[PDB]
Amino acid sequence: ISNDIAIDLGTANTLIYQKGKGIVLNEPSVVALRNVGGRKVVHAVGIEAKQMLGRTPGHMEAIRPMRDGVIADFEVAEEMIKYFIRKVHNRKGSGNPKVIVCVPSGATAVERRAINDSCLNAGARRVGLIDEPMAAAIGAGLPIHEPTGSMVVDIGGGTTEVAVLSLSGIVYSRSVRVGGDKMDEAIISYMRRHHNLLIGETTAERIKKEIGTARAPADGEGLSIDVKGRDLMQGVPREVRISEKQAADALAEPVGQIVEAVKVALEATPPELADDIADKGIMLTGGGALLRGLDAEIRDHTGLPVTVADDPLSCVALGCGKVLEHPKWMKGVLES
């Protein structure tokens, strides 16, 4: 049995795929730091940190060490990664493992060295890096080996990466800093400006999942829920109701940037490849791809068919996993 692992180091979620086990770990990429006499110390990581925040006062502080598709905190990213790697270690398995890590396509040398070191520091022999859109496309089923063109749109928490693949290569790649976190920030700004109500991340993610949509009902308001927060002048808790119409209104800006990033990618793409993507469709992946109507909105504005992958939260990790299982393929990237 193997200790070989592939890591999908998301801004919102970290996934680890183990050779011969599939997905062994799926946890929020948060660290909880307690502040004490000027210092900050790592208290919990992952689902534990997210649990004990939400039971949160004064000390317990939240660091997302990857954020907006960049490494913000090198010290805490290292310890996050270490924790996760140690946590999936199997003692009845091969020595120090081979590791694959999925990095943003707009990742610099430095951030790559940083990833690679955090992994060696955690007990790996060798480390290979694979560009995210390439992993997303493989994970999703795309025929990235054919000379036919393929398009993948990966909507994360901090980033939306759009890429066109052909012939085992990336022909075009671009990332924009818009995804599920800007969606939440927009819903929370909307609650403040229109209904004068302060809300949190959790209430926000809940609205986005429950009535969020990239396109308003043709009706007028559609469905509604009630959400709790607190009045921003009075301090008292309050309930307000909100429609799918309001949510659509709230999300239109970040949705529109996503749509614009797809149009821009098409305008850069070679016509013959563009016509291939026209036949098979644009493939959406990543958790942001689960927003209602988002595929329907990209279809209207581009003219192209659009499909959401199966298990879009897991694509990058499955694609990384596929490379891990294929020794000759993993070869290709350790030579990176």
Ligand SMILES: Nc1ncnc2c1ncn2[C@@H]1O[C@H](COP(=O)(O)OP(=O)(O)NP(=O)(O)O)[C@@H](O)[C@H]1O
């Ligand atoms: N039903 C849903 N509708 C809309 N958004 C959702 C839904 N479920 C999850 N999400 C969002 O999906 C995002 C996380 O997706 P994910 O693909 O895990 O991100 P990531 O890989 O960690 N970020 P990144 O490094 O930018 O690629 C969060 O912003 C969630 O709010």
Ligand SMILES: [Mg+2]
């Ligand atoms: Mg991602």
